[PDB]
Structure 1
Amino acid sequence: VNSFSGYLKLTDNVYIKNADIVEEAKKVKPTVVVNAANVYLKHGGGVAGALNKATNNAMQVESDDYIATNGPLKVGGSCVLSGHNLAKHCLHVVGPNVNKGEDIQLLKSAYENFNQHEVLLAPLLSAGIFGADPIHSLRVCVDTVRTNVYLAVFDKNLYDKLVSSFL
Protein backbone atom coordinates (compact mmCIF):
# COMPACT_ATOMS: atom_id res chain seq x y z
CA VAL A 1 0.00 0.00 0.00
CA ASN A 2 1.19 3.63 -0.64
CA SER A 3 0.04 7.28 -0.01
CA PHE A 4 -1.02 8.14 -3.61
CA SER A 5 -4.77 9.05 -3.73
CA GLY A 6 -7.37 9.48 -6.52
CA TYR A 7 -5.29 7.95 -9.37
CA LEU A 8 -6.91 5.99 -12.23
CA LYS A 9 -5.12 2.65 -12.75
CA LEU A 10 -4.03 2.23 -16.42
CA THR A 11 -1.95 -0.96 -16.08
CA ASP A 12 -0.42 -3.28 -13.49
CA ASN A 13 2.17 -0.55 -12.69
CA VAL A 14 1.06 2.81 -14.20
CA TYR A 15 -1.42 5.18 -12.56
CA ILE A 16 -2.58 8.67 -13.73
CA LYS A 17 -4.25 11.73 -12.14
CA ASN A 18 -5.16 15.34 -13.17
CA ALA A 19 -2.90 17.45 -10.96
CA ASP A 20 -0.07 19.95 -10.96
CA ILE A 21 3.05 17.83 -10.17
CA VAL A 22 4.29 20.69 -7.83
CA GLU A 23 1.03 20.61 -5.75
CA GLU A 24 1.09 16.78 -5.55
CA ALA A 25 4.68 16.34 -4.23
CA LYS A 26 3.99 18.77 -1.35
CA LYS A 27 1.06 16.57 -0.13
CA VAL A 28 2.59 13.04 -0.64
CA LYS A 29 6.34 13.72 -0.02
CA PRO A 30 7.12 10.73 -2.27
CA THR A 31 10.50 8.95 -2.10
CA VAL A 32 11.12 10.14 -5.72
CA VAL A 33 9.68 13.04 -7.73
CA VAL A 34 10.77 13.18 -11.39
CA ASN A 35 11.77 16.53 -12.88
CA ALA A 36 11.42 17.25 -16.60
CA ALA A 37 15.01 18.45 -16.76
CA ASN A 38 17.28 19.71 -19.53
CA VAL A 39 20.96 18.72 -19.84
CA TYR A 40 22.11 21.97 -18.13
CA LEU A 41 19.64 21.53 -15.19
CA LYS A 42 18.45 25.08 -15.95
CA HIS A 43 15.01 24.97 -14.31
CA GLY A 44 13.47 28.11 -16.00
CA GLY A 45 9.89 27.14 -16.75
CA GLY A 46 7.50 24.22 -17.16
CA VAL A 47 7.77 21.33 -14.64
CA ALA A 48 11.40 22.29 -13.79
CA GLY A 49 10.69 26.00 -13.22
CA ALA A 50 7.57 25.20 -11.20
CA LEU A 51 9.35 22.49 -9.03
CA ASN A 52 12.33 24.80 -8.61
CA LYS A 53 10.11 27.77 -7.62
CA ALA A 54 8.46 25.56 -4.96
CA THR A 55 11.98 24.88 -3.49
CA ASN A 56 12.67 28.66 -3.25
CA ASN A 57 15.45 28.17 -5.87
CA ALA A 58 17.33 25.62 -3.69
CA MET A 59 16.94 23.03 -6.50
CA GLN A 60 18.72 25.45 -8.93
CA VAL A 61 21.53 26.19 -6.43
CA GLU A 62 22.15 22.44 -5.93
CA SER A 63 21.90 21.83 -9.70
CA ASP A 64 24.45 24.53 -10.57
CA ASP A 65 26.98 22.92 -8.20
CA TYR A 66 26.20 19.48 -9.82
CA ILE A 67 26.86 20.83 -13.33
CA ALA A 68 30.01 22.72 -12.28
CA THR A 69 31.42 19.37 -10.98
CA ASN A 70 30.05 16.86 -13.54
CA GLY A 71 29.16 18.74 -16.72
CA PRO A 72 25.87 18.40 -18.57
CA LEU A 73 23.61 15.34 -18.61
CA LYS A 74 22.94 13.37 -21.81
CA VAL A 75 19.58 13.62 -23.57
CA GLY A 76 17.88 10.41 -22.34
CA GLY A 77 19.94 10.49 -19.11
CA SER A 78 19.31 11.41 -15.51
CA CYS A 79 20.81 12.22 -12.13
CA VAL A 80 19.53 11.85 -8.60
CA LEU A 81 19.65 14.99 -6.43
CA SER A 82 17.82 16.18 -3.35
CA GLY A 83 14.02 16.42 -3.31
CA HIS A 84 14.27 19.45 -1.00
CA ASN A 85 10.84 20.21 0.56
CA LEU A 86 9.00 18.19 -2.12
CA ALA A 87 10.31 14.58 -1.89
CA LYS A 88 13.22 12.59 -0.49
CA HIS A 89 14.94 12.60 -3.90
CA CYS A 90 14.47 14.30 -7.26
CA LEU A 91 15.26 12.21 -10.32
CA HIS A 92 16.14 14.80 -13.00
CA VAL A 93 15.36 13.08 -16.32
CA VAL A 94 16.12 14.60 -19.74
CA GLY A 95 13.57 13.71 -22.34
CA PRO A 96 14.20 14.88 -25.92
CA ASN A 97 13.02 18.44 -26.61
CA VAL A 98 11.24 18.36 -30.03
CA ASN A 99 11.45 22.22 -30.08
CA LYS A 100 15.34 21.71 -30.26
CA GLY A 101 15.25 18.89 -32.92
CA GLU A 102 16.18 15.95 -30.55
CA ASP A 103 15.53 12.31 -31.61
CA ILE A 104 12.11 11.22 -30.19
CA GLN A 105 13.53 7.59 -30.07
CA LEU A 106 15.46 8.96 -27.03
CA LEU A 107 12.16 9.08 -25.11
CA LYS A 108 12.35 5.31 -24.37
CA SER A 109 15.92 5.73 -23.01
CA ALA A 110 14.66 8.61 -20.81
CA TYR A 111 11.85 6.47 -19.32
CA GLU A 112 14.31 3.59 -18.68
CA ASN A 113 15.77 5.72 -15.85
CA PHE A 114 12.51 5.25 -13.94
CA ASN A 115 13.19 1.49 -13.63
CA GLN A 116 16.00 2.23 -11.12
CA HIS A 117 13.33 3.38 -8.61
CA GLU A 118 10.56 1.18 -7.15
CA VAL A 119 7.96 4.01 -6.89
CA LEU A 120 7.92 7.49 -8.50
CA LEU A 121 5.71 10.56 -8.89
CA ALA A 122 6.36 11.84 -12.45
CA PRO A 123 5.18 14.02 -15.33
CA LEU A 124 4.90 12.73 -18.85
CA LEU A 125 8.41 13.07 -20.30
CA SER A 126 8.89 15.34 -23.30
CA ALA A 127 5.32 16.60 -22.81
CA GLY A 128 4.32 20.18 -21.91
CA ILE A 129 6.90 22.78 -23.10
CA PHE A 130 9.21 19.89 -24.39
CA GLY A 131 6.73 19.60 -27.29
CA ALA A 132 6.16 15.86 -27.70
CA ASP A 133 2.74 14.33 -28.28
CA PRO A 134 1.65 13.44 -24.70
CA ILE A 135 -0.38 10.45 -26.02
CA HIS A 136 2.87 9.05 -27.41
CA SER A 137 4.72 9.83 -24.16
CA LEU A 138 2.12 7.86 -22.17
CA ARG A 139 2.39 4.88 -24.57
CA VAL A 140 6.22 4.84 -24.23
CA CYS A 141 5.87 5.14 -20.44
CA VAL A 142 3.51 2.13 -20.23
CA ASP A 143 5.68 0.06 -22.59
CA THR A 144 9.01 0.96 -20.86
CA VAL A 145 8.54 1.54 -17.13
CA ARG A 146 8.14 -1.65 -15.06
CA THR A 147 8.28 0.03 -11.64
CA ASN A 148 5.29 1.78 -10.07
CA VAL A 149 4.74 5.20 -11.62
CA TYR A 150 2.14 7.79 -10.56
CA LEU A 151 1.72 10.29 -13.42
CA ALA A 152 0.47 13.84 -13.14
CA VAL A 153 -1.18 15.50 -16.21
CA PHE A 154 -1.43 19.32 -15.64
CA ASP A 155 -4.13 19.97 -18.33
CA LYS A 156 -7.60 18.67 -17.16
CA ASN A 157 -8.47 18.67 -20.87
CA LEU A 158 -5.31 16.65 -21.70
CA TYR A 159 -5.87 14.28 -18.76
CA ASP A 160 -9.36 13.41 -20.07
CA LYS A 161 -7.99 12.89 -23.60
CA LEU A 162 -5.12 10.65 -22.31
CA VAL A 163 -7.58 8.43 -20.39
CA SER A 164 -10.26 8.33 -23.12
CA SER A 165 -7.72 7.40 -25.86
CA PHE A 166 -5.68 4.88 -23.78
CA LEU A 167 -5.40 1.41 -25.34
Structure 2
Amino acid sequence: VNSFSGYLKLTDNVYIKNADIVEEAKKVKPTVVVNAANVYLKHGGGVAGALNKATNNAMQVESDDYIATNGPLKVGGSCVLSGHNLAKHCLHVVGPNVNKGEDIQLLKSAYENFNQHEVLLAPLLSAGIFGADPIHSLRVCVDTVRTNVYLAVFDKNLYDKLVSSFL
Protein backbone atom coordinates (compact mmCIF):
# COMPACT_ATOMS: atom_id res chain seq x y z
CA VAL A 1 0.00 0.00 0.00
CA ASN A 2 1.17 3.53 -0.92
CA SER A 3 -0.24 7.11 -0.55
CA PHE A 4 -1.31 7.96 -4.14
CA SER A 5 -5.04 8.89 -4.12
CA GLY A 6 -7.79 8.77 -6.75
CA TYR A 7 -5.71 7.09 -9.42
CA LEU A 8 -7.48 4.89 -12.00
CA LYS A 9 -5.97 1.38 -12.37
CA LEU A 10 -5.05 0.74 -16.04
CA THR A 11 -2.92 -2.44 -15.65
CA ASP A 12 -1.23 -4.51 -12.99
CA ASN A 13 1.36 -1.75 -12.52
CA VAL A 14 0.16 1.46 -14.27
CA TYR A 15 -2.25 3.98 -12.73
CA ILE A 16 -3.49 7.32 -14.13
CA LYS A 17 -5.02 10.54 -12.84
CA ASN A 18 -5.96 14.02 -14.20
CA ALA A 19 -3.73 16.34 -12.16
CA ASP A 20 -0.80 18.75 -12.26
CA ILE A 21 2.29 16.57 -11.52
CA VAL A 22 3.81 19.46 -9.50
CA GLU A 23 0.73 19.60 -7.25
CA GLU A 24 0.65 15.80 -6.93
CA ALA A 25 4.31 15.83 -5.91
CA LYS A 26 3.72 18.55 -3.29
CA LYS A 27 0.92 16.47 -1.73
CA VAL A 28 2.46 12.93 -1.95
CA LYS A 29 6.19 13.68 -1.59
CA PRO A 30 6.97 10.49 -3.57
CA THR A 31 10.32 8.76 -3.47
CA VAL A 32 10.71 9.55 -7.19
CA VAL A 33 9.12 12.20 -9.40
CA VAL A 34 9.98 11.99 -13.10
CA ASN A 35 10.85 15.16 -15.00
CA ALA A 36 10.28 15.46 -18.76
CA ALA A 37 13.81 16.75 -19.29
CA ASN A 38 15.89 17.75 -22.30
CA VAL A 39 19.54 16.75 -22.74
CA TYR A 40 20.77 20.12 -21.38
CA LEU A 41 18.50 19.98 -18.30
CA LYS A 42 17.17 23.42 -19.28
CA HIS A 43 13.83 23.42 -17.46
CA GLY A 44 12.00 26.13 -19.38
CA GLY A 45 8.44 24.95 -19.98
CA GLY A 46 6.00 22.08 -19.81
CA VAL A 47 6.48 19.64 -16.94
CA ALA A 48 10.11 20.70 -16.49
CA GLY A 49 9.40 24.42 -16.27
CA ALA A 50 6.52 23.77 -13.87
CA LEU A 51 8.55 21.47 -11.60
CA ASN A 52 11.52 23.82 -11.58
CA LYS A 53 9.31 26.83 -10.73
CA ALA A 54 7.91 24.92 -7.72
CA THR A 55 11.51 24.43 -6.47
CA ASN A 56 12.18 28.19 -6.65
CA ASN A 57 14.79 27.46 -9.40
CA ALA A 58 16.83 25.14 -7.14
CA MET A 59 16.29 22.32 -9.64
CA GLN A 60 17.86 24.47 -12.39
CA VAL A 61 20.83 25.45 -10.20
CA GLU A 62 21.53 21.81 -9.36
CA SER A 63 21.06 20.82 -13.01
CA ASP A 64 23.52 23.42 -14.28
CA ASP A 65 26.19 22.02 -11.95
CA TYR A 66 25.36 18.48 -13.16
CA ILE A 67 25.82 19.50 -16.82
CA ALA A 68 29.01 21.44 -16.10
CA THR A 69 30.51 18.27 -14.57
CA ASN A 70 29.03 15.55 -16.80
CA GLY A 71 27.92 17.10 -20.09
CA PRO A 72 24.53 16.56 -21.71
CA LEU A 73 22.35 13.52 -21.32
CA LYS A 74 21.48 11.25 -24.26
CA VAL A 75 18.03 11.28 -25.82
CA GLY A 76 16.47 8.22 -24.18
CA GLY A 77 18.71 8.63 -21.12
CA SER A 78 18.27 9.86 -17.57
CA CYS A 79 19.95 11.02 -14.39
CA VAL A 80 18.90 10.99 -10.73
CA LEU A 81 19.10 14.33 -8.93
CA SER A 82 17.46 15.79 -5.85
CA GLY A 83 13.69 16.04 -5.59
CA HIS A 84 14.06 19.28 -3.61
CA ASN A 85 10.76 20.14 -1.91
CA LEU A 86 8.75 17.89 -4.25
CA ALA A 87 10.12 14.35 -3.76
CA LYS A 88 13.13 12.51 -2.39
CA HIS A 89 14.61 12.19 -5.89
CA CYS A 90 13.90 13.55 -9.34
CA LEU A 91 14.53 11.17 -12.24
CA HIS A 92 15.23 13.46 -15.21
CA VAL A 93 14.29 11.43 -18.31
CA VAL A 94 14.81 12.63 -21.89
CA GLY A 95 12.14 11.44 -24.29
CA PRO A 96 12.53 12.27 -27.98
CA ASN A 97 11.21 15.72 -28.95
CA VAL A 98 9.30 15.43 -32.25
CA ASN A 99 9.34 19.27 -32.58
CA LYS A 100 13.19 18.98 -32.75
CA GLY A 101 13.12 15.97 -35.18
CA GLU A 102 14.25 13.13 -32.80
CA ASP A 103 13.60 9.36 -33.37
CA ILE A 104 10.27 8.29 -31.77
CA GLN A 105 11.71 4.75 -31.38
CA LEU A 106 13.79 6.26 -28.56
CA LEU A 107 10.61 6.57 -26.48
CA LYS A 108 10.85 2.94 -25.35
CA SER A 109 14.47 3.48 -24.24
CA ALA A 110 13.34 6.54 -22.27
CA TYR A 111 10.65 4.56 -20.43
CA GLU A 112 13.14 1.76 -19.61
CA ASN A 113 14.75 4.17 -17.13
CA PHE A 114 11.61 3.86 -14.98
CA ASN A 115 12.38 0.16 -14.34
CA GLN A 116 15.29 1.15 -12.07
CA HIS A 117 12.77 2.51 -9.51
CA GLU A 118 10.11 0.51 -7.68
CA VAL A 119 7.51 3.32 -7.62
CA LEU A 120 7.35 6.62 -9.55
CA LEU A 121 5.11 9.63 -10.07
CA ALA A 122 5.54 10.47 -13.75
CA PRO A 123 4.31 12.24 -16.91
CA LEU A 124 3.70 10.63 -20.33
CA LEU A 125 7.08 11.04 -22.04
CA SER A 126 7.38 12.80 -25.42
CA ALA A 127 3.78 14.15 -25.12
CA GLY A 128 2.69 17.79 -24.76
CA ILE A 129 5.25 20.23 -26.20
CA PHE A 130 7.57 17.29 -27.15
CA GLY A 131 5.19 16.65 -30.08
CA ALA A 132 4.31 12.93 -29.93
CA ASP A 133 0.86 11.32 -29.66
CA PRO A 134 -0.02 10.87 -25.94
CA ILE A 135 -2.07 7.76 -26.79
CA HIS A 136 1.13 6.28 -28.23
CA SER A 137 3.19 7.36 -25.22
CA LEU A 138 0.74 5.65 -22.85
CA ARG A 139 0.90 2.44 -24.91
CA VAL A 140 4.72 2.42 -24.83
CA CYS A 141 4.61 3.12 -21.07
CA VAL A 142 2.30 0.18 -20.35
CA ASP A 143 4.31 -2.12 -22.63
CA THR A 144 7.74 -1.10 -21.22
CA VAL A 145 7.50 -0.15 -17.56
CA ARG A 146 7.26 -3.07 -15.15
CA THR A 147 7.58 -1.10 -11.90
CA ASN A 148 4.68 0.80 -10.34
CA VAL A 149 3.97 4.04 -12.18
CA TYR A 150 1.45 6.73 -11.23
CA LEU A 151 0.85 8.91 -14.29
CA ALA A 152 -0.36 12.48 -13.78
CA VAL A 153 -1.96 14.00 -16.91
CA PHE A 154 -2.27 17.82 -16.89
CA ASP A 155 -5.01 18.30 -19.51
CA LYS A 156 -8.46 17.11 -18.38
CA ASN A 157 -9.72 16.73 -21.94
CA LEU A 158 -6.69 14.59 -22.91
CA TYR A 159 -7.05 12.45 -19.76
CA ASP A 160 -10.63 11.56 -20.68
CA LYS A 161 -9.47 10.61 -24.17
CA LEU A 162 -6.55 8.51 -22.86
CA VAL A 163 -8.90 6.52 -20.63
CA SER A 164 -11.64 6.10 -23.22
CA SER A 165 -9.21 4.93 -25.93
CA PHE A 166 -7.06 2.62 -23.76
CA LEU A 167 -6.81 -0.95 -24.96
What SS does the aligned partner of 1:67 have?
helix
How far the C-alpha of 1:27 sits from its partner, in A, is 0.0
CA distance in 2, matches of 1:36, 1:129: 10
Give the equivalent residue in structure 2 for 1:84: 84
Please list the CA deviations of residues 38-75 of structure 1 after superposition, one character each: whole Å capped at 9, or x if unmatched: 00000001000000000000000000000000000000
Give the equivalent residue in structure 2 for 1:163: 163
How far the C-alpha of 1:122 sits from its partner, in A, is 0.1
What SS does the aligned partner of 1:51 have?
helix
Please list the CA deviations of residues 71-112 of structure 1 after superposition, one character each: whole Å capped at 9, or x if unmatched: 000000000000000000000000000000000000000000
How far the C-alpha of 1:127 sits from its partner, in A, is 0.7
Unaligned runs of 5+ in 2: none
What SS does the aligned partner of 1:53 have?
helix
How far the C-alpha of 1:35 sits from its partner, in A, is 0.0
What SS does the aligned partner of 1:59 have?
helix
CA distance in 1, matches of 2:22, 2:36: 12
How far the C-alpha of 1:123 sits from its partner, in A, is 0.3
What SS does the aligned partner of 2:53 have?
helix
How far the C-alpha of 1:28 sits from its partner, in A, is 0.0
Unaligned runs of 5+ in 1: none
How far the C-alpha of 1:115 sits from its partner, in A, is 0.1
TM-score when scaled to structure 2? 1.00
CA distance in 1, matches of 2:4, 2:45: 26
What SS does the aligned partner of 1:43 have?
coil
CA distance in 1, matches of 2:16, 2:63: 28
Equivalences, count: 167
What SS does the aligned partner of 1:99 have?
helix
CA distance in 2, matches of 1:53, 1:139: 29
How far the C-alpha of 1:163 sits from its partner, in A, is 0.2
Q: Which runs of 4+ in 1 moved over 3 A?
A: none
TM-score when scaled to structure 1? 1.00
How far the C-alpha of 1:116 sits from its partner, in A, is 0.1
CA distance in 2, matches of 1:5, 1:20: 13
CA distance in 2, matches of 1:85, 1:120: 16
How far the C-alpha of 1:113 sits from its partner, in A, is 0.0
Give the equivalent residue in structure 1 for 2:10: 10
What SS does the aligned partner of 1:6 have?
coil
CA distance in 1, matches of 2:23, 2:156: 14
How far the C-alpha of 1:126 sits from its partner, in A, is 0.4
What SS does the aligned partner of 1:120 have?
strand
